[PDB]
Amino acid sequence: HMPKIWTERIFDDPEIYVLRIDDDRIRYFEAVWEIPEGISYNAYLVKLNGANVLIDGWKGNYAKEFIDALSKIVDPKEITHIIVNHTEPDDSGSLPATLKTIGHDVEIIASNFGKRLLEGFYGIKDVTVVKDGEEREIGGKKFKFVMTPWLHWPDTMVTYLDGILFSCDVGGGYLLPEILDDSNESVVERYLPHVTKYIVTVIGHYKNYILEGAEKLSSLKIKALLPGHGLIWKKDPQRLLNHYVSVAKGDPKKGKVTVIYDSMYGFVENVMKKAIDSLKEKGFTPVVYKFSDEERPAISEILKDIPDSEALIFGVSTYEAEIHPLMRFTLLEIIDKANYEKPVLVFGVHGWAERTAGELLKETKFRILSFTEIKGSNMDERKIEEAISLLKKELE
């Protein structure tokens, strides 16, 4: 079993190829986010009169495969320019091998911070810095460079060529789609939730910069969006940009409530089962994640469901001086990646001295409607109904 590689001419004029590798070996993106669905690395080649322009690259463990694939569509000795929109090694790891294969000087183009990172990572010193809005005539065509910082590093930019946007992480998603582009509706619908997962896990801390970036790109006429991961968008690139904006804003789906809890011995479970049944009774559709002694949800899946939730509900055990370690971890990641102005209910056990969840959420945009104590024998089921009814009233 070898990774699937796509090499296809995607435009006739300008003459543009994609080189895409489907990474089905990776398990944890950035060594953290669970992606059993995989991720692609997409690089591009523009073949012109007097220039051949490589745009981005592949992860470094696939450097040999990249050189071999590239060599089927151009002599590497004839590459003249390499554009690096973002220097993170999932997109730049093949660059040292590429430069060695080319075997002579080439013009490397990056943002100001990108130049600093290429020096730090790889010792590459001969880098041309492009400034915001700068245009460069290469091979008879106008390339325009637009800085879109903090999507998700300070080095990030997008390259515009006659309406075609090479955007690297901007517009990426997880998943290995069965086609290259947005030409099939069923594929698009299956893909978009993996775009949401990518946005929150990779970009979520910087989600306000998605809004700034989309506003900046709105001044360009975009015919196609060619990102570094996932589908290419030739039919309807605005649909992808709209989805990015919707996730960044946290636009909710009516009725959706995400319920996250730990249960050690069934006490939290007993309360949360009743809360979930009450949600359904009242017309909501819960999405449930339970940390138990047999089950351990993926944090990337929890995070994916936050942006379009109308509300969140947490069930928390106290543990030593604080709260259950996996609920601590989950809350810290939600705060870091998915800090939205949404209502929350907390159900909690009292500890030896359960203010922790509120302290964690204090400096966030979430608003806790109520805290309800999880008791054992003498639990008052009416207080569960009270809390769900309060949430329903808040969302009317």
The binding site for Cl ion (CB under 5 A) comprises: 263-265, 267-268, 329
What does the angle CA 347 – CA 351 – CA 352 come to, to the nearest 5 degrees?
165
Contacting range for a copy of itself; rule: CB under 8 A; set: 76-84, 242-250, 319-327, 355-363: 319-327
- Report how far residue 73's alpha carbon sits from residue 156's, in angstroms, rounded to the nearest whole number: 27
Say whether residue 294 binds a copy of itself (CB under 8 A). Answer: yes
- Residue pointed to by tokens 């073949």: 47
* Beta carbon nearer to a copy of itself, 189 or 321: 321
Selected from 179, 211, 220, 332, the binder of a copy of itself by CB under 8 A is 332
To a copy of itself, the closest distance from the beta carbon of 337 in angstroms equals: 9
Q: Which of 347, 369, 354, 370 is nearest to 270 (CA)?
A: 347
**Which residues in 56-67 are b (16+ Cβ under 10 Å) and which e?**
bbbbbebbebbb
- Residue pointed to by tokens 């994916």: 304
Selected from 169, 182, 308, 333, the binder of a copy of itself by CB under 8 A is 333
Q: In the range 54-73, which residues lie near a copy of itself by CB under 8 A?
A: 59-60
- Report how far residue 304's alpha carbon sits from residue 295's, in angstroms, rounded to the nearest whole number: 19
Contacting range for a copy of itself; rule: CB under 8 A; set: 6-14, 152-160, 169-177, 356-364: 152-160
* Beta carbon nearer to a copy of itself, 152 or 342: 152
Say whether residue 32 binds a copy of itself (CB under 8 A). Answer: yes
Say whether residue 353 binds a copy of itself (CB under 8 A). Answer: no
List the structure tokens of 200: 């929150």
Beta 39-48 vs 15-23: how paired, if at all? antiparallel
Q: In the range 164-193, which residues lie near a copy of itself by CB under 8 A?
A: none
* Beta carbon nearer to a copy of itself, 12 or 353: 353
- Residue pointed to by tokens 């060599």: 71
Say whether residue 200 binds a copy of itself (CB under 8 A). Answer: no
* Beta carbon nearer to Cl ion, 6 or 267: 267
Site string for a copy of itself, 214-253 (x = CB under 8 A): ----------------------------------------
The sign of the CA dihedral 227, 233, 238, 240 is negative
* Beta carbon nearer to a copy of itself, 120 or 358: 120
Burial classification of residue 265, based on how many CB atoms lie within 10 Å of its CB (0-12 exposed, 13-18 middle, 19 or more buried)? exposed
To a copy of itself, the closest distance from the beta carbon of 261 in angstroms equals: 10
Residue 52 binds which entry of Cl ion, a copy of itself, none, with Cβ cut-offs from 5 to 8 Å by kind?
none
Classified as helix, coil or strand, 254 is coil
Q: Are 9 and 15 in contact (CB under 8 A)?
A: yes
**DSSP one-letter string for 293-341:** SS----HHHHHHHSTT-SEEEEEE-EETTEE-HHHHHHHHHHHHH----
Q: What is the dihedral of CA 344, 348, 350, 352, to 10 degrees?
A: -100
Q: Which of 343, 195, 323, 308 is nearest to 264 (CA)?
A: 323
* Beta carbon nearer to a copy of itself, 208 or 238: 208
Classified as helix, coil or strand, 224 is strand
CA distances from 313 to 305, 359, 371 (A): 12, 16, 10
Contacting range for a copy of itself; rule: CB under 8 A; set: 129-137, 245-253, 291-299, 359-367: 291-299
Task: Find the discontinuities in the chain where C to next N exceeds 2.5 angstroms and give the residue preceding each.
Answer: 353
Say whether residue 371 binds a copy of itself (CB under 8 A). Answer: no
* Beta carbon nearer to a copy of itself, 103 or 123: 123
Say whether residue 381 binds a copy of itself (CB under 8 A). Answer: no
* Beta carbon nearer to a copy of itself, 121 or 371: 121
Q: In the range 9-28, which residues lie near a copy of itself by CB under 8 A?
A: 25-28
Per CB under 8 A, residues contacting a copy of itself are 25-32, 59-60, 88-90, 93, 119-123, 152-154, 205, 262-267, 291-296, 299, 317, 319-320, 324-326, 328-329, 332-333, 336, 352, 375-378
